Design an enzyme around this catalytic site. Sequence first.
Site, short mmCIF file in Angstrom:
data_model
loop_
_atom_site.label_atom_id
_atom_site.label_comp_id
_atom_site.label_asym_id
_atom_site.label_seq_id
_atom_site.Cartn_x
_atom_site.Cartn_y
_atom_site.Cartn_z
CG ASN A 144 -12.14 -7.87 20.48
OD1 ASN A 144 -11.69 -8.13 19.36
ND2 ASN A 144 -12.87 -8.74 21.18
CB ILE A 145 -6.61 -6.19 23.37
CG1 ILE A 145 -6.16 -5.93 21.93
CG2 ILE A 145 -5.51 -6.91 24.14
CD1 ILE A 145 -5.06 -4.91 21.78
CD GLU A 146 -12.37 -10.85 25.02
OE1 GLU A 146 -12.06 -12.04 25.28
OE2 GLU A 146 -13.52 -10.51 24.67
CB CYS A 202 -13.90 -1.67 22.33
SG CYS A 202 -15.03 -2.05 23.70
CD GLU A 248 -15.84 -0.29 18.51
OE1 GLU A 248 -16.99 -0.12 18.95
OE2 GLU A 248 -15.16 -1.31 18.75
CB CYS A 251 -19.70 -0.52 23.86
SG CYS A 251 -18.27 0.35 24.55
CB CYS A 274 -16.44 2.64 21.57
SG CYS A 274 -15.21 1.35 21.90
N1 LIG Z 1 -18.30 -3.03 19.07
C1 LIG Z 1 -17.66 -3.59 20.10
C2 LIG Z 1 -18.42 -4.44 20.95
C3 LIG Z 1 -17.74 -5.34 21.68
N2 LIG Z 1 -16.37 -5.42 21.59
C4 LIG Z 1 -15.63 -6.45 22.34
O1 LIG Z 1 -16.33 -7.68 22.28
C5 LIG Z 1 -16.16 -8.41 23.54
C6 LIG Z 1 -17.51 -8.65 24.17
O2 LIG Z 1 -18.24 -7.44 24.35
C7 LIG Z 1 -15.18 -7.57 24.36
O3 LIG Z 1 -13.89 -8.01 23.95
C8 LIG Z 1 -15.44 -6.16 23.83
O4 LIG Z 1 -14.37 -5.26 24.02
C9 LIG Z 1 -15.65 -4.54 20.75
O5 LIG Z 1 -14.41 -4.61 20.73
N3 LIG Z 1 -16.33 -3.63 20.01
ZN LIG Z 2 -16.49 -0.27 23.00
#
Ligand SMILES: Nc1ccn([C@@H]2O[C@H](CO)[C@@H](O)[C@H]2O)c(=O)n1
Ligand SMILES: [Zn+2]
Lengths: 137, 135, 134, 137
Positions: D45-47, D56, D58, D90, D93
């Site tokens: 994940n890259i915020e 995310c 994935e 999520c 994804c």
């Molecule tokens: N299975 C998922 C669920 C969440 N995330 C990442 O976690 C952080 C909070 O949701 C956010 O950085 C979100 O993108 C993820 O990368 N993959």
């Molecule tokens: Zn996701």
Amino acid sequence: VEPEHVQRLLLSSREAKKSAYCPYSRFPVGAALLTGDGRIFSGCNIENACYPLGVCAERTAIQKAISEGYKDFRAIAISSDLQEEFISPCGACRQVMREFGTDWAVYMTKPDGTFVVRTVQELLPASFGPEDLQKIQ
Amino acid sequence: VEPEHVQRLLLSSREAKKSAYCPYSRFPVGAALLTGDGRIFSGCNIENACYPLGVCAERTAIQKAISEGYKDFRAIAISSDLQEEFISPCGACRQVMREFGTDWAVYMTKPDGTFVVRTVQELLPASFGPEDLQK
Amino acid sequence: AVEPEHVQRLLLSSREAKKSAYCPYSRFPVGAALLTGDGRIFSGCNIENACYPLGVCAERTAIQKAISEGYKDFRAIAISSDLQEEFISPCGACRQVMREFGTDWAVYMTKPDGTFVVRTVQELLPASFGPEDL
Amino acid sequence: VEPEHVQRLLLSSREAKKSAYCPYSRFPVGAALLTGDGRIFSGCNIENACYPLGVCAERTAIQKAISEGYKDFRAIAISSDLQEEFISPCGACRQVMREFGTDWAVYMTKPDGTFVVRTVQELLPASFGPEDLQKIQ
Ligand SMILES: Nc1ccn([C@@H]2O[C@H](CO)[C@@H](O)[C@H]2O)c(=O)n1
Ligand SMILES: [Zn+2]
Ligand SMILES: Nc1ccn([C@@H]2O[C@H](CO)[C@@H](O)[C@H]2O)c(=O)n1
Ligand SMILES: Nc1ccn([C@@H]2O[C@H](CO)[C@@H](O)[C@H]2O)c(=O)n1
Ligand SMILES: O=c1ccn([C@@H]2O[C@H](CO)[C@@H](O)[C@H]2O)c(=O)[nH]1
Ligand SMILES: [N]
Ligand SMILES: [Zn+2]
Ligand SMILES: [Zn+2]
Ligand SMILES: [Zn+2]
């Protein structure tokens, strides 16, 4: 317009456009990100049946680099099939670029090899960023 | 825009901030959009456990307005609790604003009422837009 | 699932909302309308952008409108499109946003003739990631 | 003991977690995508300061694969620091995964290496897809 790294950016960006997954817009976009140590990460747009879930070439490239541990970016070039317009990064890509610095170059190109250069700071003035959440300390 | 609307817009922006759903960042943001005929539409940021799925105040406001048949905007004001700096729209919001014109006003404020104004064009130079997909 | 009256109102609302859809790129209009616990209705339409990823779905436009006005208790949401032989289903991102506000509420996936299929948010997004994860 | 490819996926997913750029949530996530020909693409994940602009793990992994010409996906694994709860993808994804098929596997793991595996179809029933946009119907 001809330094070695510029030539590399334009060629990679143009080449990256070939991998684009854009059956909905038929608007292919390629990007080539140049890191500080000279490595180049390419990217392309990847769309989705549900339009909002697609991703831009610029972000595909940036996300690739970061996932592989590179966060120091020197420049990024963008390529498209528009012959009479320099292809410009959308606001969302500018924001992601900004997350990693305001002081790097964006090469907005045309298929003929001509281009216009602007910095992330210039492309996103008075930018929202890490400081807004008081993350810089 | 008219100082009468400017004030109404600025207050509308702050009030909208009260409805913000932001339990993850705890950073509430409000926005208010003024249409060509004088109607105002406001919005707030709405986060999600999975961060990318959240939405910004500006777009909540813009989306609301469009869903009601309004696509002619004169100005938009933004409000947050950030004291040290004027709140400015993220690049994504600037791109949504641009979809509907570049000549309108963006009011970036501070909790004390001070603000700075810049057009969408000035906030998103050499922008990508609808023209790119025409012809 | 709710009473045929609230369902009908949701139906007409989503279809009416669909008329405001801003979708010059896909030319695929979508409308949505949700019902809150106190009986109020909020609708929405998809709103696209020259840069495709910046568009928004009808469901999230409706949901975001409701929340911005203080409502977070949802009973049902109806979706309408122009697909004749397809019940219009919510995309994954919309399901995740719906989930943020509960899993035990109904989603009405309709066809232009008023026929529909109704499933709960939980059934549309099994073993979901949610606020509890954090 | 798990099949060779399952061990690779699980370990790569766990490793990708290290490159996670998540200063806002401090919730690192890694992903590993297995293609039909055996190649593995990882992601994290890259915020972004503006939460909605993050991505995310994935999708980071899926976008990397596609940008390089790989669309035939066999399975994808997700890893997180959530000790007592399998990390699930999520909805956004799941929709991106579905763009490239519904019959492939998703491995939802825990740090101890245990996991639950469901197909994309099972995680996104009655899904909206490319088919809904085909002009002829
Ligand atoms: N299975 C998922 C669920 C969440 N995330 C990442 O976690 C952080 C909070 O949701 C956010 O950085 C979100 O993108 C993820 O990368 N993959
Ligand atoms: Zn996701
Ligand atoms: N059930 C869904 C599925 C799709 N859409 C909208 O339809 C267009 C094409 O994906 C895009 O405008 C997309 O947002 C929607 O609003 N609701
Ligand atoms: N410079 C930009 C501008 C646009 N795009 C992609 O092109 C399609 C139409 O906007 C969409 O696929 C969009 O993501 C891009 O990748 N980079
Ligand atoms: O464009 C701005 C920038 C950020 N935020 C919101 O502020 C929080 C911090 O990122 C998030 O909920 C984000 O949507 C806005 O609403 N508008
Ligand atoms: N903002
Ligand atoms: Zn972009
Ligand atoms: Zn924003
Ligand atoms: Zn959706």
